[PDB]
């Protein structure tokens, strides 16, 4: 990835082997958790499309998920070409390159072309666009890897409220929906699926009670 170099002139610095090892280890140890998206977004800050292609090729296993990721990248490139076609217009006095769906995906774009598109003024946000595409793909993958539906989350007879709410919020974060749907679900589904012993306790507190009040109520 390119980085601000002293003084004020961005030059290309190849991806460090330690970053690739960290990525391989986090994909090996954590599989495909919701948190990987932030770890991926933070490990590849300002990365050229070639670096993101390297980081997606260095993965070991989960080839089905990588195939969905590649297909969604292709779909985003296709839609991007459809949303950004060259309509006839007077030619600009200044010419700057332009990134195609295939030029953004780093397939047919040489490293020099990407460095140009990034360091030129005004900059072309090819890296951020490809990162948005990969993040959409990773969201698809982590929502697919969900073992059970959020509607099936129910507490055991003696399962403490601690592990119950932990697993429930984990599955809810892995689940995909708008924020208002989650706001309705945390009020309609959480208290209902609890164990009756502590369900009575949560009902005694009130419907609009916060999480900490219920948690300290059923505490112990």
């Amino acid at each position: 990835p390119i980085v601000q170099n002293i003084q004020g002139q961005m030059v290309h610095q190849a991806i460090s082997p330690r970053t690739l090892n960290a990525w391989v280890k986090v994909v090996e140890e954590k599989a495909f958790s919701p948190e990987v998206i932030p770890m991926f977004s933070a490990l590849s800050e300002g990365a050229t499309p070639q670096d993101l292609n390297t980081m997606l090729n260095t993965v070991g296993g989960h080839q089905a998920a990588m195939q969905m990721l590649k297909e969604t990248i292709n779909e985003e490139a296709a839609e991007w070409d459809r949303v950004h076609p060259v309509h006839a217009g007077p030619i600009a006095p200044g010419q700057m390159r332009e990134p195609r769906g295939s030029d953004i995906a780093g397939t047919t774009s040489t490293l020099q072309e990407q460095i140009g598109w990034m360091t030129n003024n005004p900059p072309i946000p090819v890296g951020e666009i490809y990162k948005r595409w990969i993040i959409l793909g990773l969201n698809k993958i982590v929502r697919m890897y969900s073992p059970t539906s959020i509607l099936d989350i129910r507490q055991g007879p003696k399962e403490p409220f601690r592990d119950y709410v932990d697993r429930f919020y984990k599955t809810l974060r892995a689940e995909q929906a708008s924020q208002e749907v989650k706001n309705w679900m945390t009020e309609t589904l959480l208290v209902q699926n609890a164990n009756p012993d502590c369900k009575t306790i949560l009902k005694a507190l009130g419907p609009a009670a916060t999480l900490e009040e219920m948690m300290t109520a059923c505490q112990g």
Binding site: Q95, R97, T110, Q112, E113
Partner: protein, 164 residues
């Protein structure tokens, strides 16, 4: 923004003059990068010390066969051959730098510098640059060629590189 490369031309080792070219990388980018990179020699192989093997007075000067030195060879920086990038630019006059080929999608490293308007070539050879400085050096070169192309003296690219 558009690269500029030069060629110091030589006729049997006597220095003759410098031709410099503006490559239209903003319309034919992959074609322009291949001539730029072959001129610098940065990928290991290139134009330096190759000759114009076919010069036809009033038509064009052709060169760029650095592997076989007679029009049967040459290779690109993408492999031996690549596609015709596009045909936006046309052969409008002297000084236009256009790609030689052996039919469609067969571009390698051979190029030709036109010394006349050659509209019949339009749509069949990708144009990707034009002489900037040095056209009378290209014109003087014509005298060492013939109707069929055979040249009388060895005409070489003594040195070449990028200027801007």
């Amino acid at each position: 923004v558009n690269p500029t490369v030069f060629f110091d031309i030589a006729v049997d080792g006597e220095p003759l003059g410098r031709v410099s070219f503006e490559l239209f990388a903003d319309k034919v980018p992959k074609t322009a990068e291949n001539f730029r990179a072959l001129s610098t020699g940065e990928k290991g192989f290139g134009y330096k010390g190759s000759c114009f093997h076919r010069i036809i007075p009033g038509f064009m000067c052709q060169g760029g066969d650095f592997t076989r030195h007679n029009g049967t060879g040459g290779k690109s920086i993408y492999g031996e051959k690549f596609e015709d990038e596009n045909f936006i630019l046309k052969h409008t006059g002297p000084g236009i730098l256009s790609m030689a080929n052996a039919g469609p999608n067969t571009n390698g490293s051979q190029f030709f510098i036109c010394t006349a308007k050659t509209e019949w070539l339009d749509g069949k050879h990708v144009v990707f640059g034009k002489v900037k400085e040095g056209m009378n050096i290209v014109e003087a070169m014509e005298r060492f060629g013939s109707r069929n192309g055979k040249t009388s003296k060895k005409i070489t690219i003594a040195d070449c590189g990028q200027l801007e």
